[PDB]
């Protein structure tokens, strides 16, 4: 179409028409001569470590959001709409910023998720619990909110999606940041013997903690301490209450020897290093959580070469023919590890979804979004699971990727800027 | 870089600099606001079913190629170069087209493959056998060349890459087309009982053949007849000599019951429906072949829902728990089917490569191409295998995709145009 883009499913031949892309103003990183679809950080809005948006750069963005928000409730042009535009406008003029009402914040958070093109679990987007932490002023206050978020979200295993929003960035005053990449994660330690204990992905953070006084248990699965930063002040260490950290011992439903591998993982995945942008406002500390898709742990966390990298050990115990890759011993061990993960979480009755169920519901979500919103931004490279790709329905689904706002963006690691 | 694009491997942290993209003039389908990286046919050059390039549209393209060809041999600007440019130019003026010398044709074919961004086996690109069939004038002549190609390429199981190039398109005279999607493929028949015998992907072609007199054996693995079109004349049916069609009975190295499934596949993959473009010239009939990557058969050909779709049967025989997707019975059966395929071809000593070995050599190829050519166009969506994606090195490799020429493009199915 000369404006209406079509995406087809090559497995079912269903074709959809996308008009929603016409509302994108942000750049993807691609040009008519080159495609950057497989670049992790095409740095098209990875949040500038620079200053902060100015009054002139903030009102247009603030206005774009309100127009969008009010059109949502079918009140575009209303007095309320125009009244609100004048308030924010006048408010930005005097304070160089503005405050979102509670309703606009909830709408913005849900849509940041709704617009997350790399997220396969968006069918859940409208069911998000928003915790307003904008009145927080210290690291102890942040610790409290986080513990409450973790308890709520965990819900004794029956996981519930949630996000806690700390004060937005200002200019000078300074901002809030959760130095951890995820609320709950395991430490990593580079052994002197060239070995690496724990999660290799968290070695640089583990060092920051240790230097701050953390008493690393020097174990394989040590839950890291929270390193919180409020109002641009130095970060502070806090130990999330163990009773609040739900974990699952990994065992196999057929291989009794699997237990002995000593594998375990935490049940609540919670991202804490991203930035939430709503109406030109930037919320640099907005930890959010949902639940795991089995492959995140079984394929990536456990089998990534630069992660726990457990394929050999498992393969050995299975007495596999690891003399040639053609035996597919890696693939075979990979399937068992993922069967163990699902079986375990399900046994402990901790919420989790397998890549088969997760991808099918995403297709349903896409069809829903095309019907009611005119489209759905999706990043194929990220939506397709790291194992058994073509046996899942998303592999055969063409997807259009574009940037819509509100949204979640990436931001510089706090220790690569924060002074002192 | 303000011109030098960088691709990184997130598993090894190696970063490469791409300058080669600066030589792309063709469009990818993406824009700064939207990415079409997962669209199968972004119709950016899927060969226009229209007329044919004119003299004015042909010389610039012819010139671009020669300049490229002569720069290859480090003779840009030479007398030979300029002499050749004037010949082709003058030749296009009188005949409205031109003829590539043997050397330019071989260089062009190898580079069409070298530039194939969706191909994971390009490390082999410089080792291609080029068969010049430009003197062919009838369907019988095409049949002969094809049989010879198949015999050469097959080489009794020790497969060798090759391509046979029939006469280029002209204007009126008319062109050559191999109506088959691949030289060797199985027929498909829609059963009256809603069933579908054979390969569902080939049902429409099987009908064309049958209507042309083909005596379909109405079996599950019936090698289709060749339907050749020379000089725009109606296509003619030919039966490739069975002794020339190498096939492999699929059996498992542990499950003796696998044999009984009656699975078999042919050893030579040969694409015959694409169009080769060199110097503005279009070779609408240029069948090419190499060898299989295990997953093409085991994952896609056998397990695609719209293909043989054999996951249940296999799963049943394995006595798997197919009551819930969480058991990963599909994944488990998928690994065994692929172990069977590799084991079988290897047993019969027919060339084949597993996704692990194939993807690692592609990484090596990429590193080679960045060193000597300044880059390598790669389509991530296609390069990453349909199973166990993240355990292969290409999954963690960022790839830049752009169109370089010479190249292989798609073209309209011959029966959707050819009259009579
Ligand atoms: C309801 C359950 C949910 C599931 C199963 C789910 C699953 C996923 C998965 C598998 C990924 C890939 C993660 C990776 O590869 O590292 C992902 C990415 C993402 N999810 Fe979801 N998600 C859910 C809820 C949420 C929530 C509550 C939010 C936000 C409010 C969210 C925002 C995102 C974002 C921003 C990404 C992209 C991360 C990036 O770009 O680095 N997800 N999700
Ligand atoms: C030497 C062994 C080779 C291997 C293992 C290999 C493997 C592959 C694989 C796995 C695909 C995916 C096919 C699909 O998903 O349908 C592919 C695509 C492709 N290969 Fe190669 N290849 C090889 C040789 C060749 C040769 C000889 C040529 C041409 C001279 C070639 C040209 C291409 C092209 C054009 C595509 C893209 C197809 C499309 O866009 O639809 N390949 N190759
Ligand atoms: N299923 C989840 N897991 C999850 C989601 C997102 C991420 C973030 C992955 N970020 C990768 C990345 C890519 C590029 C640059 C950077 Cl800094 C980071 C991690 C786990 C959920 C997390 C919160 C809700 S669901
Ligand atoms: N390994 C091979 N297999 C193979 C390569 C390419 C194709 C072509 C796949 N085309 C898919 C497609 C995609 C979009 C539109 C159309 Cl018409 C067709 C098939 C098998 C080789 C074939 C020739 C040499 S290697
Ligand atoms: C290089 C490539 O973009 C990178 O490895 C991507 C591929 N797809 C992914 N998909 C998900 N869900 N998560 C990831 O971290 C990645 N990594
Ligand atoms: C929709 C999506 O682009 C499509 O299913 C692609 C994905 N990757 C692929 N990769 C290869 N090698 N072959 C294919 O046919 C496909 N299909
Ligand atoms: Zn793109």
Tab-separated table of N, CA, C and O and ligand atoms in Angstrom, chain A residues 37-40 118 300 381-384 386, chain B residues 8 10 380 394-399, ligand 5:
chain	number	residue	atom	x	y	z
A	37	UNK	N	18.597	-3.514	11.834
A	37	UNK	CA	17.686	-4.297	12.651
A	37	UNK	C	18.283	-5.259	13.664
A	37	UNK	O	17.599	-5.662	14.602
A	38	UNK	N	19.545	-5.640	13.493
A	38	UNK	CA	20.159	-6.565	14.437
A	38	UNK	C	21.211	-5.903	15.315
A	38	UNK	O	22.018	-6.585	15.929
A	39	UNK	N	21.205	-4.571	15.365
A	39	UNK	CA	22.142	-3.832	16.214
A	39	UNK	C	21.445	-3.670	17.575
A	39	UNK	O	20.305	-3.207	17.650
A	40	UNK	N	22.136	-4.066	18.637
A	40	UNK	CA	21.613	-3.998	20.000
A	40	UNK	C	21.290	-2.592	20.475
A	40	UNK	O	20.218	-2.336	21.022
A	118	UNK	N	10.481	-4.880	21.714
A	118	UNK	CA	11.288	-6.068	21.992
A	118	UNK	C	10.639	-7.014	23.019
A	118	UNK	O	11.174	-8.086	23.299
A	300	UNK	N	19.476	-18.659	27.800
A	300	UNK	CA	20.411	-17.542	27.950
A	300	UNK	C	21.202	-17.494	29.262
A	300	UNK	O	22.431	-17.504	29.240
A	381	UNK	N	13.966	-9.833	15.768
A	381	UNK	CA	15.226	-10.324	16.309
A	381	UNK	C	15.127	-10.659	17.796
A	381	UNK	O	15.775	-11.581	18.270
A	382	UNK	N	14.306	-9.908	18.522
A	382	UNK	CA	14.139	-10.106	19.957
A	382	UNK	C	12.934	-10.944	20.349
A	382	UNK	O	12.968	-11.657	21.349
A	383	UNK	N	11.870	-10.850	19.560
A	383	UNK	CA	10.643	-11.583	19.832
A	383	UNK	C	10.778	-13.094	19.638
A	383	UNK	O	10.164	-13.875	20.371
A	384	UNK	N	11.569	-13.518	18.659
A	384	UNK	CA	11.746	-14.951	18.440
A	384	UNK	C	12.687	-15.537	19.503
A	384	UNK	O	13.809	-15.045	19.709
A	386	UNK	N	15.294	-17.862	21.769
A	386	UNK	CA	16.664	-18.312	21.505
A	386	UNK	C	16.833	-19.813	21.218
A	386	UNK	O	17.953	-20.295	21.066
B	8	UNK	N	29.262	-5.334	16.538
B	8	UNK	CA	29.969	-6.009	17.603
B	8	UNK	C	29.427	-7.415	17.836
B	8	UNK	O	28.280	-7.726	17.498
B	10	UNK	N	28.489	-9.750	20.786
B	10	UNK	CA	28.296	-9.606	22.221
B	10	UNK	C	28.780	-10.791	23.028
B	10	UNK	O	28.781	-10.748	24.253
B	380	UNK	N	20.488	-10.975	9.504
B	380	UNK	CA	20.402	-11.725	10.760
B	380	UNK	C	19.199	-12.671	10.834
B	380	UNK	O	19.316	-13.824	11.254
B	394	UNK	N	26.350	-16.943	15.569
B	394	UNK	CA	25.760	-15.856	14.784
B	394	UNK	C	24.660	-15.080	15.507
B	394	UNK	O	24.426	-13.914	15.207
B	395	UNK	N	24.003	-15.724	16.468
B	395	UNK	CA	22.943	-15.092	17.251
B	395	UNK	C	23.455	-13.843	17.981
B	395	UNK	O	22.744	-12.844	18.074
B	396	UNK	N	24.691	-13.911	18.478
B	396	UNK	CA	25.335	-12.826	19.229
B	396	UNK	C	26.114	-11.851	18.353
B	396	UNK	O	26.790	-10.949	18.852
B	397	UNK	N	26.003	-12.033	17.044
B	397	UNK	CA	26.712	-11.204	16.085
B	397	UNK	C	25.805	-10.164	15.437
B	397	UNK	O	24.811	-10.513	14.803
B	398	UNK	N	26.128	-8.884	15.615
B	398	UNK	CA	25.346	-7.840	14.976
B	398	UNK	C	25.746	-7.927	13.507
B	398	UNK	O	26.904	-8.216	13.181
B	399	UNK	N	24.787	-7.681	12.624
B	399	UNK	CA	25.026	-7.760	11.195
B	399	UNK	C	24.385	-6.591	10.471
B	399	UNK	O	23.252	-6.221	10.756
C	5	LIG	C1	23.389	-9.363	17.903
C	5	LIG	C2	21.958	-9.580	18.229
C	5	LIG	O1	21.162	-8.422	17.968
C	5	LIG	C3	21.727	-9.938	19.725
C	5	LIG	O2	22.496	-11.087	20.031
C	5	LIG	C4	20.238	-10.134	20.079
C	5	LIG	C5	19.438	-11.137	19.274
C	5	LIG	N1	18.102	-11.381	19.860
C	5	LIG	C6	17.890	-11.211	21.187
C	5	LIG	N2	16.627	-11.464	21.700
C	5	LIG	C7	16.326	-11.328	23.028
C	5	LIG	N3	15.115	-11.573	23.510
C	5	LIG	N4	17.337	-10.922	23.866
C	5	LIG	C8	18.677	-10.629	23.460
C	5	LIG	O3	19.511	-10.271	24.314
C	5	LIG	C9	18.898	-10.796	22.065
C	5	LIG	N5	20.240	-10.524	21.555
